[PDB]
Design a protein around this motif. Structure first.
Motif, PDB file in Angstrom:
ATOM      1  N   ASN A 207    -101.737  60.542  16.770  1.00 50.69           N
ATOM      2  CA  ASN A 207    -101.150  60.625  18.101  1.00 50.69           C
ATOM      3  C   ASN A 207    -100.662  59.283  18.634  1.00 50.69           C
ATOM      4  O   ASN A 207     -99.972  59.266  19.657  1.00 50.69           O
ATOM      5  CB  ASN A 207    -102.157  61.227  19.091  1.00 50.69           C
ATOM      6  N   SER A 208    -100.952  58.177  17.951  1.00 51.46           N
ATOM      7  CA  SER A 208    -100.930  56.858  18.569  1.00 51.46           C
ATOM      8  C   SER A 208     -99.551  56.193  18.479  1.00 51.46           C
ATOM      9  O   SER A 208     -98.586  56.746  17.937  1.00 51.46           O
ATOM     10  CB  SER A 208    -102.001  55.981  17.924  1.00 51.46           C
ATOM     11  N   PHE A 209     -99.459  54.985  19.043  1.00 53.19           N
ATOM     12  CA  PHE A 209     -98.286  54.126  18.923  1.00 53.19           C
ATOM     13  C   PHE A 209     -98.241  53.464  17.551  1.00 53.19           C
ATOM     14  O   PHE A 209     -99.268  53.265  16.894  1.00 53.19           O
ATOM     15  CB  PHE A 209     -98.306  52.999  19.963  1.00 53.19           C
ATOM     16  N   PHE A 235    -102.639  57.984  29.462  1.00 55.98           N
ATOM     17  CA  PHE A 235    -102.799  58.586  28.140  1.00 55.98           C
ATOM     18  C   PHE A 235    -103.040  57.494  27.098  1.00 55.98           C
ATOM     19  O   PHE A 235    -102.328  57.379  26.095  1.00 55.98           O
ATOM     20  CB  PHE A 235    -101.583  59.438  27.769  1.00 55.98           C
ATOM     21  N   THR A 236    -104.060  56.673  27.375  1.00 50.69           N
ATOM     22  CA  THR A 236    -104.266  55.448  26.610  1.00 50.69           C
ATOM     23  C   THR A 236    -104.493  55.722  25.127  1.00 50.69           C
ATOM     24  O   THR A 236    -103.999  54.977  24.273  1.00 50.69           O
ATOM     25  CB  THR A 236    -105.440  54.671  27.190  1.00 50.69           C
ATOM     26  N   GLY A 237    -105.248  56.763  24.800  1.00 54.88           N
ATOM     27  CA  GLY A 237    -105.527  57.038  23.398  1.00 54.88           C
ATOM     28  C   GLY A 237    -106.463  55.986  22.837  1.00 54.88           C
ATOM     29  O   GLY A 237    -107.501  55.666  23.427  1.00 54.88           O
ATOM     30  N   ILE A 238    -106.091  55.418  21.695  1.00 63.73           N
ATOM     31  CA  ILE A 238    -106.936  54.426  21.043  1.00 63.73           C
ATOM     32  C   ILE A 238    -106.448  53.035  21.423  1.00 63.73           C
ATOM     33  O   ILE A 238    -106.853  52.033  20.822  1.00 63.73           O
ATOM     34  CB  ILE A 238    -106.959  54.621  19.515  1.00 63.73           C
ATOM     35  N   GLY A 240    -103.058  51.736  21.824  1.00 71.30           N
ATOM     36  CA  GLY A 240    -101.907  51.111  21.185  1.00 71.30           C
ATOM     37  C   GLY A 240    -101.228  50.064  22.053  1.00 71.30           C
ATOM     38  O   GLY A 240    -100.896  48.969  21.582  1.00 71.30           O
ATOM     39  N   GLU A 259    -107.547  58.414  30.131  1.00 73.79           N
ATOM     40  CA  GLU A 259    -107.607  58.981  28.787  1.00 73.79           C
ATOM     41  C   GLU A 259    -108.745  59.987  28.751  1.00 73.79           C
ATOM     42  O   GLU A 259    -109.900  59.629  28.997  1.00 73.79           O
ATOM     43  CB  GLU A 259    -107.815  57.884  27.739  1.00 73.79           C
ATOM     44  N   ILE A 260    -108.427  61.240  28.427  1.00 73.69           N
ATOM     45  CA  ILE A 260    -109.398  62.305  28.618  1.00 73.69           C
ATOM     46  C   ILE A 260    -110.406  62.403  27.483  1.00 73.69           C
ATOM     47  O   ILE A 260    -111.499  62.948  27.689  1.00 73.69           O
ATOM     48  CB  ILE A 260    -108.672  63.644  28.831  1.00 73.69           C
ATOM     49  N   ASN A 264    -112.067  58.481  22.354  1.00 73.61           N
ATOM     50  CA  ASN A 264    -110.959  57.545  22.554  1.00 73.61           C
ATOM     51  C   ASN A 264    -111.340  56.452  23.547  1.00 73.61           C
ATOM     52  O   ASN A 264    -111.087  55.266  23.302  1.00 73.61           O
ATOM     53  CB  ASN A 264    -109.710  58.288  23.040  1.00 73.61           C
ATOM     54  N   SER A 285    -110.892  59.494  33.189  1.00 72.09           N
ATOM     55  CA  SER A 285    -110.815  60.563  32.199  1.00 72.09           C
ATOM     56  C   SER A 285    -109.540  61.399  32.334  1.00 72.09           C
ATOM     57  O   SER A 285    -108.595  61.226  31.555  1.00 72.09           O
ATOM     58  CB  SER A 285    -112.045  61.458  32.309  1.00 72.09           C
ATOM     59  N   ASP A 286    -109.506  62.300  33.320  1.00 72.68           N
ATOM     60  CA  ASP A 286    -108.433  63.277  33.474  1.00 72.68           C
ATOM     61  C   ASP A 286    -107.397  62.779  34.478  1.00 72.68           C
ATOM     62  O   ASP A 286    -107.708  62.589  35.660  1.00 72.68           O
ATOM     63  CB  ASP A 286    -109.005  64.626  33.925  1.00 72.68           C
ATOM     64  N   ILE A 287    -106.153  62.619  34.013  1.00 67.95           N
ATOM     65  CA  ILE A 287    -105.077  62.167  34.892  1.00 67.95           C
ATOM     66  C   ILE A 287    -104.845  63.154  36.027  1.00 67.95           C
ATOM     67  O   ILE A 287    -104.469  62.755  37.137  1.00 67.95           O
ATOM     68  CB  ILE A 287    -103.787  61.916  34.083  1.00 67.95           C
ATOM     69  N   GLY A 311     -97.718  57.150  26.664  1.00 66.91           N
ATOM     70  CA  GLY A 311     -97.014  58.278  26.078  1.00 66.91           C
ATOM     71  C   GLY A 311     -97.739  59.580  26.361  1.00 66.91           C
ATOM     72  O   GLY A 311     -98.923  59.713  26.045  1.00 66.91           O
ATOM     73  N   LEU A 335     -97.926  67.310  31.263  1.00 61.23           N
ATOM     74  CA  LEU A 335     -98.581  66.156  31.860  1.00 61.23           C
ATOM     75  C   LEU A 335     -97.644  64.964  31.967  1.00 61.23           C
ATOM     76  O   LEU A 335     -98.007  63.959  32.592  1.00 61.23           O
ATOM     77  CB  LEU A 335     -99.841  65.793  31.065  1.00 61.23           C
TER      78      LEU A 335
HETATM   79  N1  LIG Z   1    -105.295  65.499  31.291  1.00 57.03           N
HETATM   80  C1  LIG Z   1    -105.296  64.381  30.593  1.00 57.03           C
HETATM   81  N2  LIG Z   1    -105.655  63.244  31.210  1.00 57.03           N
HETATM   82  C2  LIG Z   1    -105.656  62.111  30.517  1.00 57.03           C
HETATM   83  N3  LIG Z   1    -105.348  61.918  29.253  1.00 57.03           N
HETATM   84  C3  LIG Z   1    -104.994  63.056  28.661  1.00 57.03           C
HETATM   85  C4  LIG Z   1    -104.937  64.296  29.239  1.00 57.03           C
HETATM   86  N4  LIG Z   1    -104.528  65.232  28.322  1.00 57.03           N
HETATM   87  C5  LIG Z   1    -104.353  64.557  27.232  1.00 57.03           C
HETATM   88  N5  LIG Z   1    -104.610  63.233  27.369  1.00 57.03           N
HETATM   89  C6  LIG Z   1    -104.503  62.212  26.346  1.00 57.03           C
HETATM   90  O1  LIG Z   1    -103.160  61.875  26.200  1.00 57.03           O
HETATM   91  C7  LIG Z   1    -103.019  61.199  24.945  1.00 57.03           C
HETATM   92  C8  LIG Z   1    -101.685  61.474  24.356  1.00 57.03           C
HETATM   93  S1  LIG Z   1    -101.444  60.597  22.833  1.00 57.03           S
HETATM   94  C9  LIG Z   1    -101.067  58.924  23.323  1.00 57.03           C
HETATM   95  C10 LIG Z   1    -101.804  57.902  22.482  1.00 57.03           C
HETATM   96  C11 LIG Z   1    -101.586  56.428  22.832  1.00 57.03           C
HETATM   97  N6  LIG Z   1    -100.156  56.100  23.005  1.00 57.03           N
HETATM   98  C12 LIG Z   1    -102.185  55.525  21.741  1.00 57.03           C
HETATM   99  O2  LIG Z   1    -101.710  54.438  21.589  1.00 57.03           O
HETATM  100  O3  LIG Z   1    -103.102  55.948  21.120  1.00 57.03           O
HETATM  101  C13 LIG Z   1    -104.189  61.645  24.085  1.00 57.03           C
HETATM  102  O4  LIG Z   1    -104.925  60.493  23.749  1.00 57.03           O
HETATM  103  C14 LIG Z   1    -104.929  62.655  24.959  1.00 57.03           C
HETATM  104  O5  LIG Z   1    -106.317  62.687  24.763  1.00 57.03           O
END
Ligand SMILES: Nc1ncnc2c1ncn2[C@@H]1O[C@H](CSCC[C@H](N)C(=O)O)[C@@H](O)[C@H]1O
Length: 353
Positions: A207-209, A235-238, A240, A259-260, A264, A285-287, A311, A335
DNA sequence: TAAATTAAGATTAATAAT
DNA sequence: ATTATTAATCTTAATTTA
């Protein structure tokens, strides 16, 4: 008119290739502060990037294939209001070809597999049954100098479709997590730890950058902010974007991360301590539960956000999705409008109206 | 029961061929 | 230029392991 993807997919320019553009004209409303950087897959259902651009102030997306930055393709769209002159790459750049990226592979690589580049890194890996099917298809020709063309065709198309590399006799296997990590520009074992399972590692990495691509775009920030930046990471993820800023030596005074996924968030906080970040990391956690007034409160405490980066989900846009490729209004990809909502809160304080 | 395993087509675009 | 064919593609979910 519809958005045509650029061929070659080099955006405003990539290293070592012709066609670099040093200046563009941005719409007045697109204009910082804050700077913002939005990422998603380029190969969406029709009309999606037109809608994304419409909600991000009509900025034309910058479409870039990360094959110009590493060994694996990654066709991504980037909407941002950053300056595009005097970009630079982080050093050293990752290995460009399969031959250099997989040094042991030349022992097992067939002459009729002409790939010098891998395809996109995804969340779904090839199976052991596929490896066996390819091995069984090739073994009746072990002492023949070359298998027939129709057998070659099946193997080649399966190695491309599933991004397989030759690792043993007649053995084409998918990439390992640490290999994905390195191709995507993360430090080794970045996603090992924090309670992340090997299965979850595959998904988070997919899913990442691609860090080198994003770092190359964000590099323009280094002369602008000598004292570091306040970052809003959606949507920070890991992490990137954070790794990219780290590799650019751009101090992160503050990162507010949304980042939910719990694992992650653990990986990001693990990275925060293992790189000895002196700034503050705040994790949400949840946006959907992050209110407008919370964003305004954070900006009042820390002095605004210099960069909003993220992203939003692609699963409802990605061609690999058999079930729910319904487009931008899907349960997860919708989202994106939460990204715009949060970004508009930041713009209201930073630029006004 | 967390983790691992496996297979499930369609949509576009890029490219080739009229 | 237009049409046909090739090619890529940040996945879901059912199921089984352990
Ligand atoms: N409701 C929500 N609130 C916050 N983050 C959410 C969400 N639904 C999904 N996500 C997160 O949105 C991300 C999209 S992927 C983006 C990954 C990031 N660019 C990187 O560098 O890794 C996922 O990590 C997912 O867990």
């Amino acid at each position: 008119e519809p958005i045509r993807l650029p061929n070659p997919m080099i955006g405003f320019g990539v290293p070592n290739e012709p066609g670099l553009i040093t200046h563009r004209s941005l719409p007045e409303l697109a204009r910082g502060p804050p700077f913002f950087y939005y990422e998603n897959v380029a190969l969406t259902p029709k009309g999606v990037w037109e809608t994304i651009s419409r909600h991000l102030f009509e900025i034309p997306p910058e479409f870039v294939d990360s094959k110009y930055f590493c060994v694996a393709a990654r066709k991504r769209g980037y909407i941002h209001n950053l300056p595009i002159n005097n970009r630079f790459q982080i050093q050293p750049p990752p290995k460009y070809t399969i031959h250099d990226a997989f040094p042991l592979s030349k022992r097992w690589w067939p002459e009729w597999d002409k790939r010098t580049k891998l395809n996109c890194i995804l969340t779904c890996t090839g199976s052991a049954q596929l490896t066996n099917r390819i091995r069984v298809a090739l073994e009746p020709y072990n002492e023949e100098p070359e298998p027939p063309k129709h057998v070659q065709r099946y193997v080649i198309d399966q190695c491309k479709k599933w991004n397989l590399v030759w690792v043993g006799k007649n053995k084409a296997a998918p990439l390992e997590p640490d290999e994905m990590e390195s191709i995507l520009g993360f430090p080794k074992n970045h996603t090992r730890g924090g309670g992340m399972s090997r299965t979850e590692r595959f998904k988070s990495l997919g899913n990442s950058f691609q860090v080198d691509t994003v770092a190359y775009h964000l590099s323009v920030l280094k002369p602008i902010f000598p004292h570091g930046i306040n970052v809003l990471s959606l949507f920070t993820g890991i992490g990137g974007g954070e790794v990219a800023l780290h590799r650019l030596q751009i101090k992160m005074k503050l990162v507010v991360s949304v980042e939910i996924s719990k694992v992650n968030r653990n990986i990001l906080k693990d990275f925060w301590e293992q790189t000895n970040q002196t700034g503050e990391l705040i994790e949400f956690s949840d946006i959907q539960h992050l209110t407008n007034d919370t964003i305004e409160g954070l900006m009042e405490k820390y002095g605004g956000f210099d960069l909003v980066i993220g992203g939003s989900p692609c699963n409802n846009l990605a061609g690999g999705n058999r079930v729910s490729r319904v487009g931008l209004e899907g349960d997860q990809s919708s989202l994106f409008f939460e990204y715009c909502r949060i970004l508009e809160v930041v713009r209201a304080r930073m630029r006004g109206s």
